[PDB]
Design a protein around this ligand. Structure first.
Ligand SMILES: [Mg+2]
Ligand SMILES: [Mg+2]
Ligand SMILES: [Mg+2]
Ligand SMILES: [Mg+2]
Ligand SMILES: [Mg+2]
Ligand SMILES: [Mg+2]
Ligand SMILES: [Mg+2]
Lengths: 427, 427, 427, 427
């Protein structure tokens, strides 16, 4: 028949795990033969997941740090990369608020359908691919890599280890470069800066990270796996079964049967160390933007795992100027990078950028009608020396690219779009 | 064996068409008994489509005009209402560019799946409903009508009269208030400011408008029907069958078999007059923002149909200051409204606000990291004086509303969200 | 200013609760005031949800029993109603196997996206509405109610009370007549006839049944709520916090933190008694089709709630003729109805009818090609005596209905479908 | 900065076109450079579309003929392969009737959203992959190739050449092996055996076929392209612009402006010869199942293109025994295969199998309840002799495969599914 997509043998997988530096301090408690046993007789190639994960991993080592902003539409990711950024962050909060498959607006509590983040990963890749296609026919080489790696939110996995597995597999099918997984109970998941957070036992989250790595291995892509702990603020945990969690149990219980637990940096450091063999990066959620609390967490973890890369949420859920002055804000990311926070991200940047700009425009328009919009259009013209291109919305969205398709099919077509447009005539 | 949703009698519908001022100069070439024959034995109520269409009809007569901005996400629509706007425009261009069900970025050429605009109508209504629910528990009466009427883009119907019918039916199921339909060939559809436009015969567009009205009648809701002509710039038409079109046919053909046709305001005036018995509002696409041309179109149509309301596209596809001075720009919508342009809209407002604001934030972030974001957050704090609420993003997307559900189910729940949040603590 | 969809006042809600016999023995632990506070200023009418819930309720009291087959496509439900059944069963197992929004084939473990069953509800209603519409234009009175009530699977709620609330809300929006809810941990959910099941505490399932009733009340519809218990086979429970479950707790614990518990009919009886004030019907999963065990459960429950209706899963996961002779199989559902099992259903009827018929067809087709298909067509022709209509597939699917739309829009249309069809000329 | 998915060079593409026998008689009116120009800087690999197309092309040359049945769910394709079939047919008609993204039941008139068939391609592939995964862990080698090639319906492209391009690209991404395209007007598209069909000019369908090859070239996969002509029965055409269609134009016109045209075998032969350079297989719809008419068509076409493979629709829209005796029926497909009809398919097999099997079961269940279902279950047990496996529905849908995933993550998990199941205990 055909040999397309034949899976590798267990031995070839094993040699890769033994010799490739990518897997240096990666623990897999399953075997290579286990991976092959799950792959069927055909392995689909996942081009964008492979390329993204590779590029992300190199970047995490070659750059002083990799930073990103949350993107919830395709055009958002295109502008992030046009503006120079080298990675995209796919916030689950933002998907909950304004981009999930239920169509509803939700708080950040794993309420939306579990395939919602994968769909947005696919959307962002499609949008980047379109900018890449448009840049090629225009000879625009100002952007080196349109296909920036995407790091996406797996939340608490929407259930057990098998829901984790399927989420990761879907994320990879959509072309994700990395994914993060937090040690909360899925059925009570919260934004790390909301209350009512409930942890799961340390070993249960190790199962989740093992499942996330298994799905990437079965899919044969080196996806970046990020472990997040919410132990800094959570005062509840589902069980005391795990001996590593028992030191923090207080004995008090809730009507639901949850266990009260002592929160803070101490559970966070211990969970980071338990997750380290199972995590390419480690992220601890914090209550404030504090370089000193971050140094304290960082140093402890590298004390046992010196090569362990970390990740930091520069969260809009912090009132930044209530806590830091302008000098500290301006150095914040650079300082974190020195401590080993190699991936830093503003989770809700898209939500705030979108909501503020539309309120600003709409309130102007409610008072001044067209004068309000022309101010925006003039700001857009001005931004073109900075590299902005979306003022010409027709080309920005592919009109010239689909013209090229139409003339490739029929060079004499009288129904192409850009010729005779007001964009060609006024821009 | 229930009375729920029993359809009306023919006589009942007929009497409504005869007596309700809503149908003053509305021609239906089909009968009431034709409508009943298509309704089965159960007629689903469409609450939001009914309320939206009735509210929209009133505002078109009570206000001096109705204006709106394009919205491509739910949060966008929420901010427009929060800022005082009383209607939402749902642009098909923006759906093609950044919000359609294929996942791809597309030029405005009817490339996306035909149920994409219905899905966004449903999304916007869900979002406005969430805001309405939150305001109610917060005792916030600052907005009188959260459920602003949505006017949505039907494009060229994505095919024949039955595709038109199904699109209108889906728009109504999602809660649309009004829909607009243009006289282009669906297979060659363009943004009215792109080239390569192909008109369809006058009678074929009357068929489209009749099908949109029938679908609203069968759905038993008074949807506002908007007729759009693209004849100002189109120099192609599919056929010379219609005697009303023949005066502008030149006899030149293209290789695809299209007919060349003399473009300009004269064909728009003739098509407008032909569409007026079938259209609640009439919309002529133009190539520049020109108050004198608008007046010429308006007076010509009103000479025959004095009560005929018009709609105008304040298009971002115009380079506005290259054509008008700030004085005229400032008075543009007010002047148009006096000529009878009672619905005016900026089609791509959402695209440009989203793309510009993200490029701006990202560009600063690339050079100054957290300092660029804190600037945005401080702008958001400032805008609270004008009624902005999204700085508190948790309550904005319904964290307090879902807490209320949670404590309604279990008042002693230990896992509610706002108590202990950094938002409760820092905002 | 509009009165469309204005919410009721708490007093109206209270009076309906106190006076409607629908709510005779129904406990609500929240107030009518609470419900109103969640309704915003507009309540969408849910026509099919209201009509189907009312029809379902009346049928449960007017017929000896209501039976149903699992349906996973719209055409399936149409054929069930055409063949005389009076309710549709919407199996979550079948959705996981062959009709969920991930696009993947899954075992029955709550792996698919949580809006999947709602989408199939909406689909089934659309298909029944089409059959209804066709029947009207055909003058076909052979089916008195095409819109048969749909009873759909809400599984273990896909998370907490809030995930339950959103699933019930989406089911109602899609037009469901009733939904069922089982006392398993969502993250380890199983088909009742699979091993490895984990119970939640009795109170937590009461919270679920309360959440489901609350969403029905906030959506202003009398949805039938079914409580399912999995305690006949489950030997694991998440916690020993509820004193009603402690008598069955052994005290040993698993690595996951689960508690071993003594399974069988006695925990089912106790749980059923605890659920009775919050469930319109009660369902205990069993390991075999056994009338004697069903009698035991019915007698025990009814000894305290004599008017409590029960549901029974006539499961294809039983090897029927391994456990009963043809005489017992023939009387099975009649005997169950005499014991109060008023809703009875074959969950996987659609999966087995679909899978066997296609294997049988394809096997014959591989062997004798067209001869195998002609055998099917001839059986279809022979079934017309019994009322089968789908041999004429064009009309079955609405070609004549859309011809009626087409000729309503344009009575002179030269592109209608059934005239000149091979169906008109060969059938 | 990665070599993953680096596009081939134009010279590499040219060499394959010049030297690979797959492209022997394939005309491309565009260039290899035009293909690279559209590829961006990264080309995603489409494993299933590549493997499927390669297997399909091989099977069309190795086997006496390749026959298929229409499949509208994943389980349907699984049973077709289990029973020995080597290809799957994906019918646009069936998607309209029971499996499209609108949720509605439609007649076969391109009413559904244009990404519906790609979604079903992706679904079928997912379902075959799961059967493949299950077979591997079961040690089941009874099926040589679970990933049977999929031939899917592109209808009339849902618009112009760019709609055609996007549908082919979406079909490829979902993993299709071949796609067929008909010379009908998209806005008036019909099932070949409905009336009211409108042809488009010969050259316009060459543009569609060229557009379909271009998309496969840009996606770097050798998708099989089938050309369908509806000219046997269609009496209307949009235009007389093409001199190849003028021999049949009568001069009369309809009120819509369509041209009446003389239908039959003669325009079909002229159109097949025009399409042959742009089609891997050629299909003419017929009004009856007639071996002599089929013979005449093949001989006339092969008279000029001796190697041109043909495709034939064994349509359930024929009343088979009304036209043919059992002997002709039994030999029909073999006879066609000797004429060059290498792909033969029963389009609506799934619709009729699904509809008849559910009516039959439900009618029996209405009369005799469980006796009727046990009759089916016993037939399923009996079919196991023939290779049927779905009586064990738990493993059929992957309960064993997900158990293997669960015990790869945690070998001592206490929540696996098949151990303790009734399927293990009773089957
Ligand atoms: Mg998140
Ligand atoms: Mg590590
Ligand atoms: Mg538009
Ligand atoms: Mg009018
Ligand atoms: Mg179930
Ligand atoms: Mg009760
Ligand atoms: Mg078809």
């Amino acid at each position: 028949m055909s040999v397309v997509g034949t899976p590798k043998s267990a031995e070839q997988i094993q040699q890769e795990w033994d010799t490739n530096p990518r897997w240096k301090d990666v623990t897999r408690t399953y075997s290579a033969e286990d991976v092959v046993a799950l792959q069927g007789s055909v392995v689909e190639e996942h081009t964008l997941a492979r390329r993204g994960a590779e590029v992300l991993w190199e970047q995490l080592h070659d750059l002083e740090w990799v930073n990103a902003l949350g993107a919830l539409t395709g055009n958002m990711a295109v502008q992030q990369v046009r503006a120079g950024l080298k990675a995209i962050y796919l916030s689950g909060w933002q998907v909950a608020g304004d981009a999930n498959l239920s169509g509803h607006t939700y708080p950040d509590q794993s309420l939306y359908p579990a395939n919602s983040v994968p769909q947005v990963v696919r959307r962002i890749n499609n949008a980047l691919q379109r900018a890449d296609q448009i840049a090629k026919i225009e000879g625009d080489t100002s952007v080196e890599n349109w296909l920036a790696p995407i790091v996406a939110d797996g939340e608490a996995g929407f259930g057990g280890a098998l829901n984790v597995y399927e989420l990761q597999k879907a994320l990879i099918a959509a072309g994700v470069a990395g994914s993060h997984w937090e040690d909360q109970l899925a059925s009570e998941k919260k934004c790390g800066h909301l209350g009512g957070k409930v942890l799961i036992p340390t070993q249960q989250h190790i199962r989740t990270l093992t499942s996330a790595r298994l799905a990437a291995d079965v899919a044969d892509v080196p996806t970046v796996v990020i472990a997040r702990t919410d132990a800094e603020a959570a005062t509840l945990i589902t069980s005391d079964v795990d001996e590593r969690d028992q030191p923090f149990i207080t004995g008090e219980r809730t009507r639901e049967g949850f266990y009260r637990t002592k929160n803070g940096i101490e559970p966070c450091i211990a969970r980071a160390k338990a997750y380290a063999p199972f995590a390419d990066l480690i992220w601890m959620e914090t209550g404030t933007p504090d370089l000193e609390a971050a140094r304290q967490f960082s140093e402890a973890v590298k004390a046992e795992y010196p090569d362990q890369m970390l990740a930091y949420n520069c969260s809009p859920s912090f009132n930044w100027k209530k806590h830091l002055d302008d000098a500290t804000i301006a150095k914040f990311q650079k300082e974190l990078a020195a401590m080993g926070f190699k991936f830093q991200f503003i989770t809700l940047a898209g939500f705030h950028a979108l909501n503020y700009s539309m309120f600003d425009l709409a309130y102007g328009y409610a008072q001044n009608q067209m004068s309000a919009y022309v101010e925006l259009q003039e700001r857009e013209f001005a931004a073109e020396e900075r590299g902005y291109t979306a003022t010409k919305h027709q080309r920005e969205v592919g009109a010239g690219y689909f013209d090229r398709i139409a003339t490739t099919v029929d060079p004499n077509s009288s129904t192409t779009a850009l010729t005779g447009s007001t964009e060609e005539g006024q821009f």
